[PDB]
RNA sequence: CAGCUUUACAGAUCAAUGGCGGAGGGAGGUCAACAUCAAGAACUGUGGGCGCCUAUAGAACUUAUAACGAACAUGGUUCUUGCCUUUUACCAGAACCAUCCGGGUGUUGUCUCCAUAGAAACAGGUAAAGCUGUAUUUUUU
RNA sequence: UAAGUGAUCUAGAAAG
């Protein structure tokens, strides 16, 4: 099974950044993820690529459309690698 | 095999018989560790006035 | 324990105990009071053993045997156990007459058996020369008690006796020692020994003859064996206090000794 | 000792220490059944020898149905159950002398 | 039936880098010497932070109805007991203590019985062992 | 209508 996958569902609660194939940068709370990159968080702000920021409650985002998700360095410690 | 069968049978048991001047009637008996003080004198706690005998 | 495993380190024959497990059981039924009684003794054995628990030398590696090899005036066969057992018999009976004789009193004499008894009627000096103590006549009971056990394997090889019959033999002395030899009359506390092993006897002719009659011919002399072993452990320290002590004095018999006031008498 | 009777300690005694239960004992508490026989003459011997709170109660129970009716069926306002129970009361006092 | 890691293989240029390297025994003795095995559940060092924290690590053995013993003796001392009346020799309990018969573990050293090679990986094959695999919306059609 | 199970100390030798 897929590490990263892994490694998203385990940051899980942890405060996530996350970018689309758009360019439109989110960072909050990660809520729940699945084996395709469904991803949810809470309490997320959201910037277009000109800067303007946009506050917003609960977003779901789609795996495909997702270009790279940003965890915190706590999950670098420990423990799914080995 | 079973070892419940050795209920009041244990080293443990035996050791504390012998504290209490208390011989299983199966097991050992030893002189007892404390010389039995009867000095109650007739008190308010563990009276026969006092106490139930079921 | 003992099967539940398939790996171990070995014990000496010594420290098995296969009579222990029966006592340590709640008792078999319908059994006469003394077997019970015997039972509950062996287990007040057991017990107060249990309690205080005699923790080991920390220190000394040093036994006895490792020292003596150790020096070049010893040397070291594979001997037959009776041949040894012979020897010890002999030596043992020459250092008991040595001993005797180094102490003046040539009319106390030995026997083969280690009976020790007088050659006239002593006069009342030679007696009070020649009355030998508590050290002495324990080691002459010990030698008995060997040789009695020596002399039985012995008749065994020969074509005396039987093996079962050895055996037998064996037990009874094992059982016996109280009736067999005076040790117990030396040190009283060869009772307790002797004792035991009554209560083993019982236990464990009881065990051994329930669908089979009343008779001699029990062997099963383990348990009692080991129990003399292990108060001959006890004796080992003592002996060596006092039958040291004894030659010691008989080389450089003492100066100045110290009275003392702790005695009853006296202290006014 | 067993059960708080036996003899403390074997030593000095000068004796076995042996305890048989007496069969004595078990006649001493039997004859309850069987002392028995003396309680029953004696039982022999000494052997022959409000309503307007009622009244109260039943009139609450009318007025609590009374009030209960009232919940049920139109009174909302007080006044009307109030009356409504009041009057019941006075019936019931009416009717009780 | 693919892929990579290791042995068994030729003949290599042999750099490159690794790893087995001052590359050299094994099995055992009723064989030794030493260390160490009852303590804050308890071990030992290492530096660093400054007798104590924080990372490193190491750790053989013995322990939870608590112990080196699935085993059980004997002493000595007090105190209390018992047989007793003098003591030893004893009774049986207690508290401290010791002695003893044993036990491991580790390190050496020996004694015995069997034995003897100082260099192989890379380009990839030949053969065998370890694991992975079996285009229509979220990965590569 | 229901009795009657079991608790069992010891234990000798010297000198005086
Ligand atoms: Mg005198």
New interface residues.
Partial sequence: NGIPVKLLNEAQGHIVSLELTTGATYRGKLVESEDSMNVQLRDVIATEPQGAVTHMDQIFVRGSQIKFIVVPDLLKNAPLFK | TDKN??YL?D?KS??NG?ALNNAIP?????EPLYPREEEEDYNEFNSIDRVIFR | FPFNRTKGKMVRAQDVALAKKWF????DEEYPVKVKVSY??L??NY??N??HPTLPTNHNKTKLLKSLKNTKYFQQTTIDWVEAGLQLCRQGHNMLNLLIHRKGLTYLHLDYNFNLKPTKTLTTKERKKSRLGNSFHLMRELLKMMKLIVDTHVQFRLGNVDAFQLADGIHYILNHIGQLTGIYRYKYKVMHQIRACKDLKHIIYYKFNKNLGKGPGCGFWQPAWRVWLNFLRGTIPLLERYIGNLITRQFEGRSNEIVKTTTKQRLD | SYNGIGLKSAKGSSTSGHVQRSLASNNRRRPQGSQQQRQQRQNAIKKASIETHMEKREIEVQVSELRDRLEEEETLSEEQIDKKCEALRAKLTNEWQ
Avoid: A, D, I
């Avoid at chain 2, 199966?26 to 030893?30: D, L, S």
């Avoid at chain 3, 340590?24 to 008792?27: D, K, S």
């Fill in positions: 069968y050795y049978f080293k035996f050791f012998k199966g097991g050992p008996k030893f | 340590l059981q709640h008792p509950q003794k287990l007040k017990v107060l249990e309690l």
